[PDB]
Amino acid sequence: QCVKLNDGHFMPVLGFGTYAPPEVPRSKALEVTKLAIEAGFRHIDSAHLYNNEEQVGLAIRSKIADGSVKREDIFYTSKLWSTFHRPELVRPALENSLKKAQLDYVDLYLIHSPMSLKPGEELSPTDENGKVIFDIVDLCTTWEAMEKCKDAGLAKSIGVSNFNRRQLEMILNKPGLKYKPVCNQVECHPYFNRSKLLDFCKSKDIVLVAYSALGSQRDKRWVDPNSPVLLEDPVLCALAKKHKRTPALIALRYQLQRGVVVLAKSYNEQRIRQNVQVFEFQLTAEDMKAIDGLDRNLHYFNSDSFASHPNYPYSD
Numbered sequence: 001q002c003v004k005l006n007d008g009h010f011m012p013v014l015g016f017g018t019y020a021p022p023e024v025p026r027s028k029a030l031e032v033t034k035l036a037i038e039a040g041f042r043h044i045d046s047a048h049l050y051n052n053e054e055q056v057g058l059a060i061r062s063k064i065a066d067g068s069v070k071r072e073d074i075f076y077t078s079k080l081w082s083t084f085h086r087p088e089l090v091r092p093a094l095e096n097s098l099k100k101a102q103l104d105y106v107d108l109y110l111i112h113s114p115m116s117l118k119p120g121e122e123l124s125p126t127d128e129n130g131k132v133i134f135d136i137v138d139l140c141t142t143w144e145a146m147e148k149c150k151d152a153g154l155a156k157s158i159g160v161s162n163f164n165r166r167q168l169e170m171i172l173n174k175p176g177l178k179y180k181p182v183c184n185q186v187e188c189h190p191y192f193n194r195s196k197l198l199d200f201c202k203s204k205d206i207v208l209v210a211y212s213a214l215g216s217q218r219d220k221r222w223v224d225p226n227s228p229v230l231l232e233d234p235v236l237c238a239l240a241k242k243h244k245r246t247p248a249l250i251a252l253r254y255q256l257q258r259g260v261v262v263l264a265k266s267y268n269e270q271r272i273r274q275n276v277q278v279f280e281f282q283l284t285a286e287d288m289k290a291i292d293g294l295d296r297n298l299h300y301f302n303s304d305s306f307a308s309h310p311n312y313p314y315s316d
């Protein structure tokens with residue numbers, strides 16, 4: 001149930017999403033990550049931004065301590081936040097994430113976003129109009145610093161997140177490149193299926209990793225509540241009835257059959273256990289074509305706070 005990355009490491013194809021909004025106690029991330037591991041999740045997706053690495057790391061260490069898993073069975077991801085793109089900040093950021101999680105290494109470290117933010121101030125510096133304050137950083141220098149983190153053994157693999165094709169090409173074409181990104185973790189679901197970006201990633205042996213694969217958490221900070229609710233989609237519902245599964249399981253299975261590694265966040269015990277059933281059935285070619293027909297260029301994250309950033313990826 002893993003894919004081989006372009007650096008020889010292996011990534012489980014179903015990952016557990018650990019972000020929950022501030023109104024959810026930090027406490028819960030511990031409980032639910034333990035449940036996820038218990039249910040069979042072996043890929044766990046976190047980030048500095050999520051303010052949960054202590055909890056997620058403790059859950060991992062607890063399941064190691066009680067003999068449920070070994071460290072080598074777990075694939076743990078963190079992400080470099082955008083105020084730390086300047087190359088001298090990259091390794092310290094990673095070391096901080098490792099200290100929070102109390103792990104010797106991460107399996108994967110990502111550049112969280114191509115949108116660099118002003119360093120040395122707040123987590124997300126914003127101007128008087130609520131627009132994030134940009135910084136101009138050559139991301140090929142950020143990437144070089146990421147490569148050094150791999151060479152040091154702090155991260156087994158390195159990749160990117162929220163890059164568009166041109167932004168990936170900038171890294172892939174860098175003189176002296178040592179390591180390609182193993183993946184590009186992007187918003188991806190039947191309303192925004194990223195087929196052309198997926199084709200490009202496949203052509204370069206870069207794994208596309210889907211977030212908001214179940215339609216996002218529809219956070220009021222970033223998501224229009226008028227947007228269609230993915231898990232209420234009539235085609236997904238019809239397919240769920242056909243297969244006697246659920247719309248969520250259809251949406252996850254869709255990604256696996258296109259060669260996309262898929263994340264799924266749930267803080268609910270029943271749904272956490274349900275999501276692992278993605279391995280238990282399959283969709284036909286006609287089912288897949290029906291789901292492909294849902295594409296409508298819908299990125300749920302759609303905010304003024306990001307859309308003017310000079311490296312906003314959806315500009316392309």
Ligand SMILES: NC(=O)c1ccc[n+]([C@@H]2O[C@H](COP(=O)([O-])OP(=O)(O)OC[C@H]3O[C@@H](n4cnc5c(N)ncnc54)[C@H](OP(=O)(O)O)[C@@H]3O)[C@@H](O)[C@H]2O)c1
Nearest residue numbers: 017018019045211212213214215216217248264265266267
């Ligand atoms: N790289 C990035 O910039 C980026 C951006 C966004 C997200 N991510 C990562 O991707 C992960 C997942 O994306 P996401 O947070 O947008 O959420 P998601 O995976 O799209 O899930 C959306 C909602 O689906 C519900 N759900 C889960 N399983 C279900 C089921 N079987 N039936 C019905 N509902 C179900 C969950 O609610 P309950 O909790 O109530 O079950 C969850 O709030 C994040 O946690 C994070 O790790 C990365």
Ligand SMILES: COc1cc(CN)cc(Cl)c1OCC(=O)NC(C)(C)C
Nearest residue numbers: 113114115124132162222301306313
């Ligand atoms: C959802 O994305 C962001 C969240 C915060 C948190 N305050 C800050 C910034 Cl700069 C964010 O934008 C980064 C980013 O790549 N956003 C995309 C995914 C393009 C919508």
